[PDB]
Design a protein around this ligand. Structure first.
Ligand code: MG
Ligand code: MG
Ligand code: MG
Ligand code: MG
Ligand code: MG
Ligand code: MG
Ligand code: MG
Ligand code: MG
Ligand code: MG
Ligand code: MG
Ligand code: MG
Ligand code: MG
Lengths: 337, 151, 138
RNA sequence: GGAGAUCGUGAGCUGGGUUUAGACCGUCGUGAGACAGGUCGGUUACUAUCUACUAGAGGUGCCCGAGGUCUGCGGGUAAGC
RNA sequence: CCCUAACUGGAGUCCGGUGAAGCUUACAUUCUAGUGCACAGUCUAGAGACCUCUAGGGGGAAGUGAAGACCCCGUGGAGC
RNA sequence: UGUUCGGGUCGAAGCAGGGCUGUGAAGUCCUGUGGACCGUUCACAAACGAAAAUCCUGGUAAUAGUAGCAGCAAAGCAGG
RNA sequence: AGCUUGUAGUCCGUAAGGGAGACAACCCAGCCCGUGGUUAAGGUCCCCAAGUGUCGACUAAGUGUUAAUACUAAAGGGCGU
RNA sequence: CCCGAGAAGGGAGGUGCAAAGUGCCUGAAACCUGAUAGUGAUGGAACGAUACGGCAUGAAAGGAUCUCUGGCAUGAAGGAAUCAUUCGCGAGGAUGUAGUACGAAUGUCACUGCCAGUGUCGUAUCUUACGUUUUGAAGAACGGGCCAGGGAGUGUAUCUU
């Protein structure tokens, strides 16, 4: 047979395409530190999309300097509380949690997620982790953070989302001392990400239910006379005669959307503190208006409105320092027109 | 066709039995409802069956699972056997009445035996295609039910 | 407790398999990454990369990557592990890379006949290097 | 590029050709009829039991009882060319 | 058709009632290779596999329908 | 069937399970149910022994509480 | 040609048990039942009962770890040893 | 008499030696429902044969020098261990100890109350069902969904032994 060649329908890189096991995206890897101590991650909630007219500053671009309209995505990012400081012991098997110390003072809203840890072993847990770091059992220190969505009116929930955010420093003693400084406090997103720097956005994408193979893998609809013979949105064949089994690589129906996905090199364009700077007339559609401090991310982001978005500094950022942007116009006209 | 000897005999001192003689209900769903209500008290079983008929509580279908989705709460596939619930409710009411007539207390009776038996089948026909008539039956069910104030 | 430093993989595996089929002792095999495999390095890596990328993803042999799990797999091969005798023998066997914390200060016994200096050539590679070249972290 | 997968793939499709019943042309045969010759026309049956795969759940197994955050034995990728 | 999308009504999905039929020696959670009448879920050697349920379209069961209508044979027929 | 010797409402045949004997065909015994007939010696007869014929008649499954109860005229709601 | 057609012997058909991974006809073996013993074929590192057996060499290729065989690649070459 | 809307049906109750309780004598299996025993959500398949164990049963019809555990006597085939000598490069062999101690079974004396058997499960070895067509069948060759009953060398005439 003179074979006609087509690339495989869909990607096997994201299988098994199942429902993600949490509403919070999780980071499997963290970038190596390149400077002063700081949290490597922040968490916000996606409000919606608008567009800005920013002067182009991207070096070597065709349209450098001239006006462009960049679709941005406003993200509502209030302060987060660094709840716990957790140290890990590395061995042949892998990293293992060796000890934790929780902050003495914590928000009352945390009870809806977990029962409130008492203000007990604060100095003694810290000295135990210090001794563990001194003897050499400790390899890395991470901070536990939660959002405080009680302020946000567009997000219906008031329970925090707890997640781990690695500290970015050089020496494990340095990481421990910075974590001691920031433990139990509220750190705004300006203390993590700077204006104009790339990040990575992870979030559980928009669930689309149990979708078919034509939408799930983009397979071909039956064409011509075959379009009306009884199988239009069905895959043509599930396998050969041998091997006598359906492969896992055949397109088929199943859970589409609501997967965890990571987007690289999502630039930050603005670090705002008043929601009236970006909230359009009539508010956002199905959200409301912005009431906290926000960040404007260039381009799209996985997930719908109100979804938790995890922001970390980039892990494969090709480009150098990009500088501050020059926004000429944040388009706050109505999204409903 | 006629009267049925009981599969199980509780002791006649503390026994209040009642037979649902050849009901025209679904034997599979009635069997599941009988499996559920065995071991419960008469009052709680009546309350559960009333909730079943009102579509608030579902019986768990574990043996005849096909054509039944998964119900809410901590449950596998389950349904709402309205007709089986009504017939087993009538048998439960008759058992409580027999317990009253025997001087026994229906308010403490525990259903120690509650099973179904398929009765005689009324043979029917269904006019199919190509000049053929397949059967379609009115399957009858004998519903036994024994109470007792001992457990 | 068997110290598998400088021991042939198959001879150690056969000895431990017969010992476990005697049927009383829990056998810990520390330093599993330092076991020896005779033959040239190219042939050893070729066989182990062929065996690593063999099966299907739904059915096929998920041959391990860790050195301790590879040594456990090799001892698993020389047992009737689908039987109750083999299942008990594999439950009574533990293989570790390096020295775990509970085996510090413990007493070890090494097989005389499974020694690597009985071989008469330089053609060998350690099991740790084969695991590392299979992509393992240990 | 070529080739394999029952010349992969009709309980997926199509039905164009070949391989039914009708008819025409040419050539054979006294004839009925025939042609590894051509031409026109010509019915695609089934409610999926088991298994395999794709997704979604309920249990037990492990386990102070529960919750939360993680690790990584492994599996997958072309995630780019 | 490139290249599919959205929407409408009926099915399907879920629920209440009613309610058949067709395949079926047995067992059966399989996958690879060999062997075997040379096309194996059951043999041999390995590899995997906790069970149950729901939806899905049909890879396999040389799936079911059916004493092959093609070819041959019959000191079997019929028509011409 | 002829003929010899018999058993049975103080419970025959048959039916479900079990002990014993026999290489085995099978026989005998015990437990339960049953409500009227049943064997044996020596010989003789046959409408005389089933696991199978896409066997025949009857009963009954799995499929399955599944398909159908939709397509050509989508028809019902409030009060009593 | 695991093709077709003969001839001599022995087999399967009609042949158990033991062993070759499985093997109609290849080896031991022709076999009434139970027990004990020792051997046949073949094997003794583990899977698996018994040798990490002895002596003298060879092979560095995972070659090989395959009596017979429908189940096992040649010609040619090698300052490989 | 009670429940039930009920001339349905059910319970209580009675007739009857016996419900045999209106196609009603006995009342099989297939099939279905429940209970008991064993096992069971780490698990490999002709469902079984043989041996050994766990759990449950073992009232009758089966054993009572029968079941369990030992001593003593006679013990066929076979036959050590240990030690000594000598040989062998060595693994080992030969000789003696020794045809000794042992050894299937046949008797006898103590000792004990279970054993044979039945159901299910596990462990070890062996077996890819039955009939048929076949040189060759577990066949991806044909027949059977399951159970019950029916279902195939008979008579006349003649010839031969
Ligand atoms: Mg009905
Ligand atoms: Mg008609
Ligand atoms: Mg097909
Ligand atoms: Mg034919
Ligand atoms: Mg002829
Ligand atoms: Mg029959
Ligand atoms: Mg409808
Ligand atoms: Mg021969
Ligand atoms: Mg012969
Ligand atoms: Mg043989
Ligand atoms: Mg023959
Ligand atoms: Mg018969």
């Amino acid at each position: 047979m003179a074979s006609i060649h087509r690339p495989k329908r869909g990607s096997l890189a994201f299988s098994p395409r199942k429902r993600a096991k949490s509403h919070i995206p999780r980071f499997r890897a963290w970038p190596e530190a390149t400077g002063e101590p700081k949290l490597q991650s922040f968490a916000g909630y996606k409000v919606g999309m608008t567009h800005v007219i920013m002067v182009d500053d991207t070096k070597n671009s065709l349209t450098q300097g001239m006006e462009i309209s960049v679709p941005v995505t406003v993200i509502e990012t209030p302060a987060i509380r660094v709840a716990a400081i957790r140290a890990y012991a590395e061995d042949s098997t892998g990293e293992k949690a060796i000890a934790e110390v929780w902050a003495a003072d914590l928000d009352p809203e945390l009870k809806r997620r977990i029962p409130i840890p008492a203000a007990g072993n604060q100095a003694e847990a810290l000295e135990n982790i210090g001794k563990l770091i001194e003897e050499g059992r400790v390899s890395d220190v991470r901070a536990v953070i939660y959002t405080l969505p009680k302020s946000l009116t567009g997000v219906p929930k008031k329970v925090p989302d707890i997640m781990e955010s690695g500290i970015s420093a050089r020496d494990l003693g340095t990481k421990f001392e910075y974590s001691k400084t920031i433990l139990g406090t509220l750190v705004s997103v300006t203390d993590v990400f700077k204006n104009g720097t790339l990040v990575d956005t992870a979030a559980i994408t928009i669930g689309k239910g149990t979708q078919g193979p034509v939408k799930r893998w983009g397979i071909q609809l039956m064409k011509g006379k075959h379009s009306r013979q009884g199988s239009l949105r069905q895959v043509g064949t599930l396998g050969a005669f041998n091997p006598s089994r359906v492969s896992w690589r055949v397109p088929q129906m199943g859970q589409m959307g609501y997967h965890q996905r990571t987007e690289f090199n999502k630039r930050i364009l603005k670090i705002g503190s008043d929601g009236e700077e970006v909230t359009p007339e009539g508010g956002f559609i199905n959200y409301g208006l912005v009431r906290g401090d926000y960040i404007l991310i260039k381009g799209s982001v996985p997930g719908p409105s109100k979804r938790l978005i995890r922001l970390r500094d980039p892990i494969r950022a090709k480009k150098a320092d990009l500088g501050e942007p020059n926004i000429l116009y944040i388009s706050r006209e109505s999204k409903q027109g | 066709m006629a009267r049925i000897n009981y599969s199980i005999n509780g002791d006649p001192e503390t026994t209040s039995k009642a037979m649902g003689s050849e009901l025209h209900i679904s034997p599979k769903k009635s069997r599941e409802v009988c499996c559920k209500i065995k071991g419960m008290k008469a009052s709680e079983a009546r309350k559960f069956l009333e909730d079943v008929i009102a579509m608030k509580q579902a019986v768990p279908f574990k043996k005849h699972h096909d054509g039944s989705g998964h119900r809410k709460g901590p449950m596998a596939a389950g349904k709402y056997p309205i007709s089986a619930s009504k017939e087993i409710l009538k048998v439960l009411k008759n058992a409580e009445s027999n317990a009253e007539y025997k001087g026994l207390e229906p308010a403490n009776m525990y259903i120690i035996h509650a099973a179904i038996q398929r009765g005689r089948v009324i043979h029917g026909f269904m006019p199919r295609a190509r000049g053929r008539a397949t059967p379609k039956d009115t399957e009858t069910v004998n519903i036994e039910m024994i109470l007792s104030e001992v457990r | 407790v068997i110290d598998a430093k400088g021991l042939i993989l198959g001879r150690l595996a056969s000895s431990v398999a017969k010992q476990l089929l005697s049927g009383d002792e829990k056998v810990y095999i520390i330093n599993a990454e330092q076991a020896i495999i005779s033959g040239s390095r190219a042939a050893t890596l070729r066989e182990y990369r062929e065996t690593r990328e063999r099966g299907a993803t739904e059915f096929g042999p998920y041959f391990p990557k860790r050195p301790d799990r590879i040594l456990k797999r090799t001892i698993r091969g020389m047992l009737p592990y689908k039987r109750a005798r083999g299942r008990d023998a594999m439950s009574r066997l533990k293989v570790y890379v390096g020295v775990p914390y509970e085996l510090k200060g413990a007493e070890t016994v090494t097989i005389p006949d499974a020694d690597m200096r009985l071989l008469s050539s330089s053609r060998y590679v350690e099991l740790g290097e084969v695991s590392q070249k299979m992509g393992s972290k240990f």
